[PDB]
Structure 1
Amino acid sequence: NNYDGDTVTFSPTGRLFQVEYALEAIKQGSVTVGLRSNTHAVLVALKRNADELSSYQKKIIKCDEHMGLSLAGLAPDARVLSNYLRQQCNYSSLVFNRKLAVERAGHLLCDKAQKNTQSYGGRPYGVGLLIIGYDKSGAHLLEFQPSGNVTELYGTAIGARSQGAKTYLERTLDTFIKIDGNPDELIKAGVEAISQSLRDESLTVDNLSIAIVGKDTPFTIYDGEAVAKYI
């Protein structure tokens, strides 16, 4: 109760322990996997209902027609970040008549979480985001940790059993980057990636939720009997 009851106290291991606990929310939580080529980015999320008389819960939030985020951890923590990113993206359109860039929105988010973990009585947010978007620089796919740190990849995963999904993406790594101009292929490969993350959680046509963004494609969420084109 020395360093685990305070959110202001170090730690000769150079940690804050709370952040590790906030990263255990991801193990208990949902799984989502992102992968990109150089021309499209794709999120494949495993939706989960509360019981069988429940509709399955949406796990992808549209932030703009060039941007989307997806959660894998706690929903109430995700509610703060979704609002914040939309606010900054609309601010970029208003002020600079610009899309907001992918890298830059991650940076704003990182330093936001930091000063709420700094303040005593606060909490580190326990939801991990995959932030995808298409800007001038092409596609980008960021991994957002509960630390707040942002990392740039061609393919990444988080959630429960994300480790196997990175094995899968590292093997098909040179395949899906040298497919360009066809978002379809990426989606098929993404289904295979999150099948390395099952525990009898099956993938159905109402468990699978896809979201893409292209150069010529808006941010679009596919659901229904329209995800069964990639099954």
Structure 2
Amino acid sequence: NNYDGDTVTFSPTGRLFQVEYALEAIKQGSVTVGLRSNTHAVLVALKRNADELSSYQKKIIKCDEHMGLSLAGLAPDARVLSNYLRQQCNYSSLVFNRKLAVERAGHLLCDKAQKNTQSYGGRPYGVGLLIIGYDKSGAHLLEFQPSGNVTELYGTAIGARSQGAKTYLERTLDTFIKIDGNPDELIKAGVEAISQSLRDESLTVDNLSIAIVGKDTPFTIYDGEAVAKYI
């Protein structure tokens, strides 16, 4: 109200409204789902088009051979943050000959987003990210919020109507975690999860975007007729 003019101002109840408004931009964004087993981690993203003449906005970005994310909210902010991850993954390789841990990648994102919430002049990031990866401790899935909060999860979903997919994963928890050494079944579970967030529209060939990373699987994105198999 009087305390939402900038990010440097707490409200009387201890709230940061600019951060909460940035969080709101994610809810307006298109749905995206993340889930993993012990061998593989999968991203599924519903891409959004402007109209019938337009292309479908890309939702998934590769960060390294073993790591990448999906976005929901301001796409340019996801480009900035994904670029930062690419550099950090790359610094780890060049200097330490070491693939960046997914947990440490989350810690770096948290700290980068945090600086924008405590300083005058800047603004919080207006995007949410779902980071998947496979490192020395197996498969991982992270959920990034631009408040700074990063959370390691078995599965999750962010964006508009993401609550439907999140409930489904909460039921299916015991099933999909056990899908080891079977990428196609893990993707199926992700495609079935994101389907719980659909209304009116359905998953078409240029609508659906899927990514996967695992034990002997580099981070690869599937679009177009490559995802027709799963429709």
Contact 2:7 2:19 in 1 (8 A): no
Offset at residue 7 of structure 1 (A): 1.8
Give the stretch that moved more between structures: 1-10 or 70-79. Answer: 1-10
Q: Is there any run of 5+ residues in structure 1 with no aligned partner, and where?
A: none
Looking at structure 1, the residues matched to 162 and 46 of structure 2 have their Cα atoms a distance apart, in angstroms, of 12
Once the two structures are superposed, what CA deviation does each residue of 1:187-215 show, in whole Å capped at 9, x if it has no partner?
11111111111122321111111100011
Offset at residue 78 of structure 1 (A): 1.2
3-state SS of paired residue (2:221): strand
Offset at residue 178 of structure 1 (A): 1.3
Once the two structures are superposed, what CA deviation does each residue of 1:202-231 show, in whole Å capped at 9, x if it has no partner?
211111111000111111111121111122
Looking at structure 2, the residues matched to 100 and 205 of structure 1 have their Cα atoms a distance apart, in angstroms, of 33
Offset at residue 177 of structure 1 (A): 1.1
Contact 2:133 2:139 in 1 (8 A): yes
* Counterpart for residue 226 of structure 1: 226
Contact 2:211 2:219 in 1 (8 A): yes
Once the two structures are superposed, what CA deviation does each residue of 1:60-108 show, in whole Å capped at 9, x if it has no partner?
0011110101111111211210111101010000111010000001101
Give the stretch that moved more between structures: 83-92 or 108-117. Answer: 108-117
Looking at structure 2, the residues matched to 49 and 164 of structure 1 have their Cα atoms a distance apart, in angstroms, of 22
Seq. identity, %: 100
Offset at residue 118 of structure 1 (A): 1.4
Looking at structure 1, the residues matched to 122 and 224 of structure 2 have their Cα atoms a distance apart, in angstroms, of 39
Offset at residue 12 of structure 1 (A): 2.9
3-state SS of paired residue (2:112): helix
Looking at structure 2, the residues matched to 46 and 11 of structure 1 have their Cα atoms a distance apart, in angstroms, of 35
How many residue pairs get aligned? The number is: 231
* Greater fraction of residues in strand: 2
Moved over 2 A (4+): none
Give the stretch that moved more between structures: 117-126 or 93-102. Answer: 117-126
Offset at residue 115 of structure 1 (A): 1.1
Offset at residue 2 of structure 1 (A): 2.5
Looking at structure 1, the residues matched to 24 and 200 of structure 2 have their Cα atoms a distance apart, in angstroms, of 21
